[PDB]
Structure 1
C-alpha cells in the first residue's frame, strides 16, 4: 500500500487523516511532538474502520522513524492563529517548527512529495524546499484549493446551484492579497457573471480573501480545519492516483508571470510527479496588478524569513 505521513496531529492534520482514511488511499502515520495524542487520534479513527468499511492502517507516533519511505508527507505542525492575528504573525514560531519537522522527515522519505500546510504558507513552503533539498516539483503548498473552495461555496450559495458545477481559479499568496479570478470562474462552463451581479460578486471576492479570518472569529479558539483538510486530501489524492488535476497550489516559480525564485499560488497540473506543469494564464492589466501586489506581499514574507 501507499504510505502517507502527517506531521502534526492537531485539527488540520487529524481531520486530514479522516478524509484520507475514508478514501482508502493508503496507510496513514500521524506524528506529533506531544506524547499520547497522535496515538489516541489514530486509534480512534482506526476503530471507525469497521463501520465505514475502509482497510487502512492508521497509526499514531512520536518517532520520525515510523514515517520512513512515505509516498507523501503532509506538514500540519504549525501553530494556528487566534482572533486578531494575521497568518504572517506566525512566521517566527512556525519557521522553527517547519525547519525541525522537515529536517527530520525529509531524509527518511527521499522519494516523497511534500505538501506544506503550515502558515504563512508560501514562505513555509519555500523553507521546506530549502531544508529538504528536494526537487522543487515535489515540494508544494496547499492554499489555493482551499481558497477557491470557499469562493466556489459562496458562488453556489449565491446562485442557488450545486457546488458540483462551480469551478474557479484563484492565484497568489495565501493571504489578504490573495487573488480570486471571477473571469476564470464558471458554472457548468458558464461565466459566473451570468448568474451573479457585479456588486454581489465583488462582496464574494472579498469574503473569499477574508474567509480564513471569518472562521477564526467564529471559533475564537482556533482556525478552520474541515475545508483545509479536504483541500489537502484532494492534493494527496491527486499525487497518489496520478489524476493530473488542474488546481492552484503554491509552486516554485522560475519566470512565470514575471516571477522568479519564489513559491506562489499558481495553476498547475498535479500528478504522481508532483507539479507536472505550471500554467501561464493570459491575465489582463487589472488581474496582473492584483497578482503583482500579491507577489510583493509574498516577497515581504520571504524577506522576514531570511532574517530569522
Structure 2
C-alpha cells in the first residue's frame, strides 16, 4: 500500500461546504495587502484569490501557501476562473483600471464600470449569498456600480469608503495629542478623498469634545489650524503615491478590520460607504460614508450623525456630483 495508507487510516471522506470563506479579487499590491492582513488575523478558514493575470496570480498563491506553517488558514486557492470563489461569505473587490497621461474622471469610471460588468456577475453567480466589500477607486461610485450590477440588497454591498480616511485622521490626531489612535475618536464622512467631511463635533478623547475646549477648531479662526489635519488626510494618499507609487499597507489593515466585524458578526460601527438616499436631503441612488453597524449580514444599521447645515450641504454637493456621473453610465 501507499505510504499514506500505511500511515493514516481514513474514517470518512466527503468535504463540507466551506464555512468561513473570503475571496479577494485583484492581486495587485492592495489586494495582496488585504490578503496577508486577513491571513494574519485568522478571519477565514479558506481564502480564494482571482485575477486575469494568470502568472502573478499563481505566484502569489504559491508564495502564501509556502507560509502555511505560520498561518491558521488551511486552504488557499486561486484561478482566473471564478469557480474558485464559490461559497464565499465575503468577497473583497480591489480590481480596477489604471490611469494614464490624462484623462477625464468620467472616462476613468467608465473603464472600471466595464471591468465590473465582467467581475460582478461572476462573483454573484458563485457566491449569491456573500457580502460585497468594494475597495477599488473611485470607491463611492464603484460601490454604486457593484450594487447595480449585482442586484444585491443594499445591506450586502459595502464600500471601504472613509474607513481609511478616518483611521488616518485618528493617527494624525494621535501624533498631535500624544495619545494612541485607539483613544482618539474622530470621524471623516461622505465622499472618500478630496471632498470628505471632518466631523469636528464628534472629535474627542475619553469623551471630552475637542470642540468644547476649542470652539473654533477646524475653522479659519483657530490658531492651531486643525483644518490642516483634515487636509493631510485628503493629501496623505497623494504623498504616499508620489513617494512609493501607491498605497497598500494601511488599506490592507483597514479592510481586515471591516472583514473582522463582518466575519465575526461583531456589530461594531465603521465609517463605510453605503446607499444614503433619504438621508441629509439626498434623493439620488448614491453611496457615501456614514457610520455603519457591520455584521454577518453586512450593514444592518447606520448611525445618523447630527451634521451642521454646512456639513449637510457638503454631503449633498458630493451626492449631486456622484449622481451627475452615474446618470451617464451604461450597464
What TM-score does the superposition give when structure 1 sets the normalisation length? 0.91
2:239 aligns with one of 202, 214, 222 = 214
Q: Equivalent residue for 1:147?
A: 165
Is 1:303 equivalent to 2:320 in the alignment? Answer: no
Unaligned runs of 5+ in 1: none
Measure the CA separation in 2 of the matches of 1:57 and 1:244: 27
Q: 4+ runs of 1 displaced by more than 4 Å?
A: 80-89, 193-197
Q: Equivalent residue for 1:244?
A: 267
Larger Rg computed on CA atoms: 2
**Taking structure 1 as reference, are residues 57 and 126 closer, same or farther at Cα in structure 2, changes over 3 Å only?**
same
**Taking structure 1 as reference, are residues 301 and 184 closer, same or farther at Cα in structure 2, changes over 3 Å only?**
farther
Q: 1:88 Cα deviation (Å)? A: 6.4
Residues 42-72 of structure 1, C-alpha deviations (whole Å, 9 max, x = no match): 2212222323x42342222211011011101
Please provide the CA RMSD for this pair: 2.2
- Contact 2:143–2:273 (CA under 8 A) maintained in structure 1: yes
What TM-score does the superposition give when structure 2 sets the normalisation length? 0.85
Relative to its length, the structure with more helix (as a share) is 1
Q: Equivalent residue for 2:11?
A: none
Q: Equivalent residue for 1:185?
A: 203
**Taking structure 1 as reference, are residues 55 and 153 closer, same or farther at Cα in structure 2, changes over 3 Å only?**
same
Is 1:54 equivalent to 2:72 in the alignment? Answer: yes
Is 1:292 equivalent to 2:299 in the alignment? Answer: no
**Taking structure 1 as reference, are residues 87 and 201 closer, same or farther at Cα in structure 2, changes over 3 Å only?**
farther
Measure the CA separation in 1 of the matches of 2:235 and 2:155: 29
1:97 aligns with one of 107, 110, 115 = 115
1:28 aligns with one of 43, 47, 55 = 47
**How many residue pairs are counted as aligned between the two chains?**
304
Instruction: Give 3-state SS (helix, strand or coil) of 1:230's partner.
Output: helix
Q: 1:85 Cα deviation (Å)? A: 7.7
Residues 172-211 of structure 1, C-alpha deviations (whole Å, 9 max, x = no match): 1123111121222222322345598843311001111223
Measure the CA separation in 2 of the matches of 1:89 and 1:207: 27
Unaligned runs of 5+ in 2: 1-18
Q: Equivalent residue for 1:279?
A: 303
